[PDB]
């Protein structure tokens, strides 16, 4: 099931990076940087632009990205992709 | 990039089934049934289907649009995430 | 070991897989072009698009107006798709 | 699976893999062009003079770099070449 | 091609891959059990687990209290995990 | 990924692939157990011999094989394999 | 492992896959040759006359069939063509 | 799609992978020939063969005697190997 | 994992894939041997042999003359094939 | 494609991958045989036990293992495996 495996990849990827330092279940600036760089290179197409992104994702303003904020982020990307299918 | 491919699969799967009948960009009961059966067998009679169709269709237009589809997938991801909390 | 050279191969070979089916072996007629787009570029068209949208496409690609799509017209068409993809990166 | 749609992906992605290394992130300098040809199009390619002759041909707007549009023309040119094979070399 | 027969093979072979490293060749000491869980069952332990939780586990598996994990104890442990997984289906 | 984690997955999923076909969705009847053994464990495996096995596995004597009895069975096979290494 | 050794294997085996169908097991008749060209070398080649011209060219000992040797020459000849691409004319 | 077309491609490409390393870019010198044989045809050469056996081989393939193996001489060599392989199907009469 | 251990697996498993089809579950009758050779060793038989060449072979493999090929007779056969292969490595003397 | 023919290929090739290392290129000396067994048949091998094995295989007693003696050895392992099916 590509779809079930896709969910697996989404969930597992978060934890591959979140558990590196500090809170094991939350992405700090550094870990977020790794994940985006290694896992979503197409999206990231500089430190200031990173900060603007980190700010956007961290909606509860605790300086880190939890799984929930991570899902919202991925949905956002999905949202973009979907625009292609409706035919701009 | 597994993750970028994962997003691709999520978005593409929706349209593989939504465009079969009626509104090309929305899942009717029949299309949703196919997608769940063929694509999410681990998650899944007719009553339980109706309860699901009802839950996902938050704007109550009798069909599942992409946005409602995303919420549904987030929900599943949410459950998977619980496992990782030890 | 060369995705790009393989990609060119796929681009060139795909044309001839469909063009040589009927009529002129080196040109795509409305029917052959319909097959290629449907089977090979489903993301560009999408299902059951009304014959009118096909005609508008067929018209746009056939720049020398001979009612068929030759390899040169086919490349322009692919370039055009590439161009669109490139906007994503830009 | 769509070999053709993946082929287009490879064509566009390969450009950016090399163009974003130095300088203008959306254009290929002599150096980046040299990597791309060497690693991605070995079949097509070597002294520095032949490279210069090539860089010169590709850079039609004469800004010393190869933009995506110039790149597409280049790839089409290769495809053109390939196409001659299918027509028995007329 | 029998996934299930291969799966049984993997279960039996993985044990011996780690048990035969030191001491009793047919039993897992604290160190050998640490490797197996870290390398082979990362989802169960979650990376970099501290020493106390390890000890609590080593204690739970070693039902005959000989300070090591024999194949039989190992199977119970895997059954346990399988039980866990099974809950998801019901 | 992890051969061993995948191996547990296959063990658990295989059971359900056959248990949910008829009757109790979480138990293997004689018929379902026949399928699983035949298609999935051909090396291990005559109606009488089948009855003798069905009898051995069904330790709580409810005429079917639940997941717990299943794992004991697989453990038994593992046990056999282990003897080779010794 | 060894693409090249595998390539020699494919060359040799493919011949036999078709030669053994009818008549002499170790030679290609017009029909078996037509199959091999159509299914195995579609880029090289359909109308009858051009087939005859080919069968004529390959069958250098003129026994109406294509033996393995006459096959090797044919394949070498194709390789020669391909080589011209590298040998930048 | 076509094992046989791919086979010819590998045949032609492998030549050039080794011939363009040094000297004439379109011919195999003793050294390039030894690489190709060793890395691409290990079954033919077997292993740890003597500089003399190599010389005998280099000598056999270099029909026009210019001390290098060209594409044409290379085709003859592979045909030759092909011939041997063919004997197996012919049951080694 | 280990090509060689997997090879032995394939050798033993294949025998039983065909022997257990009819009659004695642990021996190969004319018919089951015909399937095995055709489906599993096509290179050895070549293509569509006459029934007579099959009989000559069945005869050769069945050393104990019980009209069937047991696992031991099977091994001898496979070793025989290996022997042949080995001649290739030994310069074909 | 043919597992069985590939299996014969592996059997024959493996021998020569080790025999041609030192001395007679077409025979296995004690050292070469040790390598082959260690690296290729780890499941079989439980200095003295090695000597007992070397002695058993070397039926013509020339202090090395030739291909024919190698086939006998492999057949022997096959016999062993066959007992399982029987
Ligand atoms: C076919 N085999 C593949 C694995 N599957 C496991 C089902 C649960 N599993 C999951 C559980 C714990 C952590 C991550 C995941 S990944 C996932 C994603 C979506 C769903 Cl509905 C279920 C899961 C199904 C059984
Ligand atoms: C390596 N090649 C892989 C394909 N890439 C496509 C980029 C756009 N694309 C997307 C667009 C429309 C529908 C589905 C998708 S799929 C996707 C997923 C994630 C992102 Cl950030 C972007 C996309 C470009 C890079
Ligand atoms: C490894 N082997 C792969 C095949 N190669 C073919 C060379 C020419 N070949 C081509 C010719 C005619 C039709 C399609 C193609 S496909 C292609 C794509 C790009 C280029 Cl530069 C050259 C080609 C040569 C190197
Ligand atoms: C099957 N999955 C593969 C990804 N697809 C994404 C659709 C757009 N996408 C594209 C966009 C941006 C950069 C590269 C590409 S690659 C491409 C090639 C051809 C077309 Cl018509 C569309 C695209 C469609 C869905
Ligand atoms: C299909 N190939 C797979 C391997 N088979 C060999 C039979 C024994 N083999 C086993 C023996 C010793 C250690 C681990 C295993 S693994 C296994 C699992 C289940 C069973 Cl019934 C039998 C085995 C049959 C042949
Ligand atoms: C990358 N993905 C691979 C699969 N991972 C398994 C996560 C939970 N999952 C499981 C859950 C429900 C049914 C079957 C299984 S299979 C399994 C085996 C062992 C363990 Cl500790 C956990 C599981 C999660 C990480
Ligand atoms: C890994 N294994 C692959 C197979 N090998 C077989 C050696 C002989 N074998 C051959 C014999 C009869 C028909 C086809 C072929 S295929 C081939 C190609 C090139 C050469 Cl030198 C030798 C052969 C030995 C090495
Ligand atoms: C599917 N795509 C694969 C690549 N194809 C290339 C066709 C020409 N090409 C060739 C040309 C120059 C060097 C090597 C080769 S490889 C080859 C082998 C046999 C033949 Cl008839 C033609 C060729 C076209 C069909
Ligand atoms: C004058 N001219 C016009 C276009 N042609 C020139 C080079 C073709 N040449 C090639 C050479 C040998 C065999 C097959 C090919 S087909 C090919 C494909 C791609 C490239 Cl970059 C170059 C080639 C053929 C004749
Ligand atoms: C270790 N080395 C020693 C030299 N040996 C060459 C003899 C094998 N012989 C053959 C004879 C003459 C020219 C080329 C070949 S290559 C070949 C391919 C297939 C077959 Cl069945 C038999 C052969 C190959 C094995
Ligand atoms: C498709 N291609 C696969 C390779 N084939 C080679 C046939 C001869 N070849 C052999 C000869 C010398 C050394 C190793 C081997 S490997 C082998 C195994 C079984 C048999 Cl009957 C024959 C062989 C021919 C058919
Ligand atoms: C990873 N897993 C691979 C399979 N392993 C099985 C061990 C015994 N197994 C065997 C047993 C019974 C019948 C056929 C076979 S197949 C085989 C071949 C050679 C040897 Cl030494 C051992 C075996 C155990 C290790
Ligand atoms: Ca962390
Ligand atoms: Ca936060
Ligand atoms: Ca619809
Ligand atoms: Ca709705
Ligand atoms: Ca046409
Ligand atoms: Ca036109
Ligand atoms: Ca640049
Ligand atoms: Ca420019
Ligand atoms: Ca231990
Ligand atoms: Ca214990
Ligand atoms: Ca029960
Ligand atoms: Ca014939
Ligand atoms: Ca002839
Ligand atoms: Ca050279
Ligand atoms: Ca020469
Ligand atoms: Ca039988
Ligand atoms: Ca017998
Ligand atoms: Ca030796
Ligand atoms: Ca001896």
Swiss-Prot record, chains C, E:
Its main location: secreted. PROSITE patterns: EF_HAND_1 (PS00018), EF_HAND_2 (PS50222), S100_CABP (PS00303). The modification N6-acetyllysine is found at residues 6, 34. Homodimer. Interacts with PPFIBP1 in a calcium-dependent mode. Interacts with PGLYRP1; this complex acts as a chemoattractant that promotes lymphocyte movement. Interacts with MYH9; this interaction increases cell motility. Interacts with Annexin 2/ANXA2. Interacts with TP53; this interaction promotes TP53 degradation. Interacts with CCR5. Interacts with FCGR3A; this interaction inhibits PKC-dependent phosphorylation of FCGR3A. GO terms for biological process: epithelial to mesenchymal transition; positive regulation of canonical NF-kappaB signal transduction. PANTHER family: PROTEIN S100-A4, S100 CALCIUM-BINDING PROTEIN. Keywords: Acetylation, Calcium, Cytoplasm, Metal-binding, Nucleus, Repeat, Secreted. One of its GO terms (cellular component) is extracellular exosome. Pfam families: S_100. Ca(2+) 2 binds at residues 62, 64, 66, 68, 73. It comes from Homo sapiens. Ca(2+) 1 binds at residues 27, 32. CDD domains: S-100 (cd00213). It is found in: Secreted; Nucleus; Cytoplasm. This is Protein S100-A4. Calcium-binding protein that plays a role in various cellular processes including motility, angiogenesis, cell differentiation, apoptosis, and autophagy. Increases cell motility and invasiveness by interacting with non-muscle myosin heavy chain (NMMHC) IIA/MYH9. Mechanistically, promotes filament depolymerization and increases the amount of soluble myosin-IIA, resulting in the formation of stable protrusions facilitating chemotaxis. Also modulates the pro-apoptotic function of TP53 by binding to its C-terminal transactivation domain within the nucleus and reducing its protein levels. The modification N-acetylalanine is found at residue 1. It comes from the Eukaryota. GO terms for molecular function: actin binding; calcium ion binding; calcium-dependent protein binding; chemoattractant activity; identical protein binding; RAGE receptor binding; RNA binding; transition metal ion binding. SMART domains: EFh, S_100.
UniProtKB/Swiss-Prot annotation, chain D:
CDD domains: S-100. Calcium-binding protein that plays a role in various cellular processes including motility, angiogenesis, cell differentiation, apoptosis, and autophagy. Increases cell motility and invasiveness by interacting with non-muscle myosin heavy chain (NMMHC) IIA/MYH9. Mechanistically, promotes filament depolymerization and increases the amount of soluble myosin-IIA, resulting in the formation of stable protrusions facilitating chemotaxis. Also modulates the pro-apoptotic function of TP53 by binding to its C-terminal transactivation domain within the nucleus and reducing its protein levels. Ca(2+) 1 binds at residues 27, 32. Residues 11-45, 46-81 form the EF-hand domain. SMART domains: EFh, S_100. Ubiquitously expressed. GO terms for biological process: epithelial to mesenchymal transition; positive regulation of canonical NF-kappaB signal transduction. Homodimer. Interacts with PPFIBP1 in a calcium-dependent mode. Interacts with PGLYRP1; this complex acts as a chemoattractant that promotes lymphocyte movement. Interacts with MYH9; this interaction increases cell motility. Interacts with Annexin 2/ANXA2. Interacts with TP53; this interaction promotes TP53 degradation. Interacts with CCR5. Interacts with FCGR3A; this interaction inhibits PKC-dependent phosphorylation of FCGR3A. The modification N6-acetyllysine is found at residues 6, 34. InterPro entries: EF-hand-dom_pair, EF_Hand_1_Ca_BS, EF_hand_dom, S-100_dom, S100/CaBP7/8-like_CS, S100_Ca-bd_sub. Keywords: Acetylation, Calcium, Cytoplasm, Metal-binding, Nucleus, Repeat, Secreted. It is found in: Secreted; Nucleus; Cytoplasm. Its main location: secreted. It comes from Homo sapiens. PANTHER family: PROTEIN S100-A4, S100 CALCIUM-BINDING PROTEIN. GO terms for cellular component: collagen-containing extracellular matrix; cytosol; extracellular exosome; extracellular region; extracellular space; nucleoplasm; nucleus; perinuclear region of cytoplasm. One of its GO terms (molecular function) is transition metal ion binding. Ca(2+) 2 binds at residues 59, 61, 63, 65, 70. This is Protein S100-A4. The keyword Nucleus applies. The modification N-acetylalanine is found at residue 1.
């Amino acid at each position: 099931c590509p779809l079930e495996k896709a969910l697996d990849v989404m969930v597992s990827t978060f934890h591959k990076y979140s558990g590196k330092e500090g809170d094991k279940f939350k992405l700090n600036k550094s870990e977020l940087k790794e994940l985006l760089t290694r896992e979503l290179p197409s999206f990231l197409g500089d430190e200031a632009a990173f900060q603007k992104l980190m700010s956007n994702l961290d909606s509860n303003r605790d300086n880190e990205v939890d799984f929930q904020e991570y899902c919202v982020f991925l949905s956002c990307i999905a949202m973009m992709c979907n625009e292609f299918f409706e035919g701009f």
